[PDB]
């Protein structure tokens, strides 16, 4: 039948005692955000979309940049 009948209704005391001993499965380490300024910029300009959209040699004027972006189609 579709009625959710449950044979194990509670947790075992060994499971409770084990949980009170080890808590490694539910803890974790620290995910640090880009640590250096260059790694911050690589997070912004280092993805496939940005790489296939931006020039290999940095162009700092939008007039010079438009010459490349105009050819991207």
């Amino acid at each position: 039948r579709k009625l959710i009948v449950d044979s194990v209704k509670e947790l075992d005391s060994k499971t409770i005692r084990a949980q009170l001993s080890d808590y490694s499965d539910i803890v974790t380490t620290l995910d640090l955000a880009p640590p250096t300024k260059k790694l911050m910029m690589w997070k912004e300009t280092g993805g496939v979309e940005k790489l296939f959209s931006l020039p290999a040699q940095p162009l700092w004027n939008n007039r010079l940049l438009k010459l490349f972006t105009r050819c991207l189609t």
Binding site: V5, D6, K9, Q19, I26, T29, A33, W60, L67
Partner: protein, 940 residues
């Protein structure tokens, strides 16, 4: 019916309850049957409890009979059913229980009939194996006890008030004492009755359901225990009830852990309830600090929040080591946890808590600098500032104090800041100014695309106005003080980008602009660091805006600077390139220095009035003729010439340009490509890399796309790459990108950039698609490093031409097989790792053709026809009967046999017949088994 009325949600619960209370008074059995049927029908049971059942049968037998009559269409019971009607049902059920107790609180509850019947039925259904009943019965019992706690709290208030009166009576001394004493006795019988009912629910349902296998039931019990101890702490905040919360904090499911933390935060909001929670905090302080680094980030946020609440009530409990772990969470990648850690840091070192160094926030600014330096997790302050932005806005936006610590002299008794501390403050100030001026969080700490609200726009305007007015006067002074330091100057030169330039003309601060311009000119003439020079060039571009009236002054300054630089370059080059003599390192240092500065200004500024191509061509030409030109001069000369040709192309857009200009541009661009091709074969790797990047970029700009978009006047400027250049570019990639497996992560990003450049040329049809075979074959071997670039290239190329991509893929697999037969030789094992790895790329490539199976018929058919001919190509030199060489290759093709539509399957076998005799159809494991597989793959 009661269930139907509660589900309909049309009438008020008090009317529903008062209607039932009136009915109970008439006949009790009829009313109790309806109340009993309600709990059974709120579980989803469509069965009925007859009066004969209630009068003769026991609770256990009734639950058994109701289980058998539980018609079920889905395992979904009311409280699991999703939808707004059912969300109303949950609150309606809970409210009915509360109202029933509230209305029957003074008379019916003490009759020894109703509550006993209800608690007995609820306890029985809380032991059932049907999740429907147990979940529902647990929720009812939990809500009944919250309601019963209220009557106990109200009874306690009355007894304390009654007892207060009895003391006064005996003090003032009487039938008043006798009647008051009867109230005391009556309230004691009532309080004892309620306590017995409450203990029955706690020892019959809570003690067992806090350990239920289903997490949903466990969370219901944990939520209610928090409510009870917050409501009646004088009887529920003992350790005998708190022990359950401590054990459940170690639960595997994070929903239940969240409920435990929320329950404990409710107790710490009241600072009075501290003596009781003190022993518990001591025992579980360790687990709470451990829950800060929880797999579920939501539980982590609540743990830091609870530690902040603990810090407020008692600070000594948390040791410095524990606090340190939480301080490290400011540099987290998740803003919610970082913001929670920022609040803990604010309340621990800053919140605790005249103009300038004497200002009230000076000590807090020095404290923040000291923290950044004592935490070597990050070298920039962007994430520290973002995390503490919503809490320390006053301190972060106090730029007068920060500027006074950097410019004003130390007061007597105040120790000075060291160069490291001063460099730290400049990093913190630049970061505060950036987030204020551009109201978006740093990368990773937000979407960065939120429409600003009205207050956000007003705040941005006032912040920018204040930044401009203060740093318009201070920036010149700061650059003069820290001019020699490259790191400090780089950071300081980025400030002018966040300024309202109109303030200079609306505020008559033009004398300050003259000083800013002089210091940028002074820094350029003294520094040779690429980053210092990039900053100076970009600062000038920001200042050089023709939309601002200050443009004339900054155009004069820029022109004067380039005049001096260009004049020196021309006079130095005339003697450096003199035929004969020997090149002193001093002369080359002077030349490199001036070329470096000009290259920087040429990226953002025109500089076309100062013709520099002739000078740069002579320097590069001499390197090709002599061979000893310093490497760094060659790199900067290549970059400068790129900008010269790029700035000329921008001016040609104007029809005002003659054909002499188009013809002059063509000759200049063609000469440059030949110079770049020469340095692509250079011995210095840096020169090879520079030439490749510039060539890849110039080839995209001067391609056939320069004619698209109605620019048909640029047809004479199209440059098509020759097979020689295409071969040389592929050689560089196969030697400097796919090499033999901090600086490692940097080299990765540089090699990824170089690969993207070549892949851009293949997706924009600048270079032939047959050149992608080498990159495609390196998919699996370099997947962790360049897989994304290769996958994008494969997808983009499939859109340009699926048939050509199919042929390119087969060549890559064909090439890897040739390399194995060059080493392992023709006599190789078909279980070797190399063959098995080659067989794995075929599986991945097959997966990339699946899309649009009815549209990729020609591509997959070509793949098979192209590979069939490679397998049957070199005949067996031993004999025309021994299996063909490379016949083993078709083992790699067997992978694509699935993608072929059945109709395509028949045709490819017809192609096979042309390269296979009936004699070749002999059964042997002697290398004849390989072919048998491909035949068997296509046969079915």
């Amino acid at each position: 019916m009661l269930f139907e009325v509660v589900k309909m949600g049309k009438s008020a619960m008090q009317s529903v309850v008062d209607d039932w209370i009136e009915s109970y008074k008439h006949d009790r059995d009829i009313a109790l049957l309806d109340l009993i049927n309600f709990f059974i029908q709120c579980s989803g049971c469509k069965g009925v409890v007859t009066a004969e059942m209630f009068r003769h049968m026991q609770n256990s037998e009734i639950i058994r009979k109701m289980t058998e009559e539980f018609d079920e269409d889905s395992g979904d019971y009311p409280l699991t059913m999703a939808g707004p009607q059912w969300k109303k049902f949950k609150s309606s059920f809970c409210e009915f229980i509360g109202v029933l107790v509230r209305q029957c609180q003074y008379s019916i509850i003490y009759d020894e009939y109703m509550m006993d019947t209800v608690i007995s039925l609820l306890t029985g259904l809380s032991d059932s194996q049907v999740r429907a009943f147990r979940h529902t019965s647990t929720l009812a019992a939990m809500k009944l006890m919250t309601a019963l706690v209220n009557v106990a709290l109200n009874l306690s208030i009355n007894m304390d008030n009654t007892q207060r009166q009895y003391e006064a009576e005996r003090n003032k001394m009487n039938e008043r004492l006798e009647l008051l004493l009867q109230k005391r006795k009556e309230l004691q019988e009532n309080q004892d009755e309620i306590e017995n009912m409450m203990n029955a629910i706690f020892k019959g349902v809570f003690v067992h359901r806090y350990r239920d296998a289903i997490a949903e039931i466990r969370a219901i019990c944990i939520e209610e225990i928090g409510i009870w101890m917050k409501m009646y702490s004088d009887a529920f905040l003992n350790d005998s009830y708190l022990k359950y919360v401590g054990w459940t904090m170690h639960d595997k499911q994070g929903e239940v852990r969240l409920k435990c933390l929320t329950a404990l935060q409710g107790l710490y909001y009241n600072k009075e309830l501290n003596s009781k929670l003190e022993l518990f905090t001591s025992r579980f302080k360790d687990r709470i600090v451990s829950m800060t680094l929880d797999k579920e980030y939501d539980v982590a946020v609540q743990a830091i929040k609870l530690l902040t609440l603990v810090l407020q009530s008692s600070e000594e409990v948390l040791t410095a080591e524990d606090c340190e772990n939480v301080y490290h969470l400011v540099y987290s990648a998740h803003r919610p946890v970082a913001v929670a850690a920022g609040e803990f840091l604010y309340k621990k070192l800053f919140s605790r808590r005249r103009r300038g160094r004497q200002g009230p926030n000076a000590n807090l600014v020095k404290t923040l600098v000291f923290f950044f330096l004592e935490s070597e997790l990050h070298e920039h302050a962007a994430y520290l500032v973002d995390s503490m932005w919503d809490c320390a806005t006053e301190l972060l936006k106090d730029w007068e104090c920060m500027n006074s610590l950097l410019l004003e002299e130390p007061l007597s008794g105040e120790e000075a800041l060291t160069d490291r501390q001063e460099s730290a403050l400049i990093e913190i100030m630049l970061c505060t100014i950036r987030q204020a001026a551009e109201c978006h969080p740093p990368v990773g700490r937000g979407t960065g695309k939120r429409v600003l609200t009205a207050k956000e726009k007003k705040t941005q305007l006032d912040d920018r106005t204040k930044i401009t007015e203060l740093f318009a006067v201070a920036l010149p002074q700061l650059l003069a003080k820290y001019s020699v330091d490259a790191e400090k100057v780089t950071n300081l030169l980025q400030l002018p980008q966040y300024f309202d330039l109109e303030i200079y003309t609306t505020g008559r601060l033009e004398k300050h602009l003259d000083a800013l311009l002089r210091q940028i000119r002074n820094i350029v003439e003294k520094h040779t660091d690429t980053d210092v020079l990039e900053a100076c060039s970009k600062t000038y571009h920001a200042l050089c805006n023709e939309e601002f009236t200050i443009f004339n002054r900054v155009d004069i300054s820029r022109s004067q600077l380039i005049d001096e630089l260009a004049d020196k370059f021309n006079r130095l080059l005339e003697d450096f390139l003199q035929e004969g003599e020997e090149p002193d390192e001093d002369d080359a240092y002077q030349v490199l220095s001036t070329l470096k500065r000009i290259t920087a200004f040429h990226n953002a500024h025109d500089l076309s009035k100062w013709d520099l191509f002739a000078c740069n061509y002579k320097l590069l030409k001499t390197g090709i003729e002599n061979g000893d030109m310093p490497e760094q001069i060659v790199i900067h000369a290549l970059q400068c010439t790129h900008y010269v040709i790029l700035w000329q192309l921008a001016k040609i857009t104007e029809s005002s340009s003659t054909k002499e200009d188009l013809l002059r541009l063509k000759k200049q661009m063609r000469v440059f490509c030949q110079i770049c091709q020469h340095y692509l074969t250079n011995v210095n790797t840096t020169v090879k890399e520079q030439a490749f990047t510039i060539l890849c970029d110039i080839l995209m700009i001067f391609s056939h796309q320069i004619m698209s978009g109605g620019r048909d006047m640029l047809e004479p400027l199209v440059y098509t790459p020759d097979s020689s250049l295409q071969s040389e570019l592929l050689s560089f990639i196969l030697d400097h990108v796919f090499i033999e497996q901090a600086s490692k992560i940097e080299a990765l990003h540089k090699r990824r950039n170089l690969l993207a450049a070549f892949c851009k040329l293949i997706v924009y049809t600048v270079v032939e698609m047959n050149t992608a075979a080498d990159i495609f074959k390196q998919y699996m071997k370099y997947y962790n490093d360049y897989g994304d670039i290769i996958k994008e290239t494969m997808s983009k190329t499939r859109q340009i031409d699926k048939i050509q991509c199919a042929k390119t893929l087969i060549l890559s697999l064909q090439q890897l097989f040739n390399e194995m037969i060059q080493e392992n030789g023709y006599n190789f094992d078909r279980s070797s790792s190399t063959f098995s790895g080659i067989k794995e790329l075929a599986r991945r490539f097959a997966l990339t053709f699946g899309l649009d199976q009815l549209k990729t018929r020609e591509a997959i058919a070509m793949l098979h026809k192209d590979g069939i001919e490679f397998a049957f190509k070199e005949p067996n030199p031993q004999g025309e009967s021994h299996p063909p060489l490379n016949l083993a290759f078709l083992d790699i093709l067997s992978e694509f046999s699935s993608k072929l539509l059945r109709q395509d399957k028949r045709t490819v076998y017809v192609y096979l017949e042309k390269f296979m005799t009936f004699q070749m159809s002999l059964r042997r494991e002697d290398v004849w088994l390989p072919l048998m597989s491909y035949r068997n793959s296509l046969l079915a």
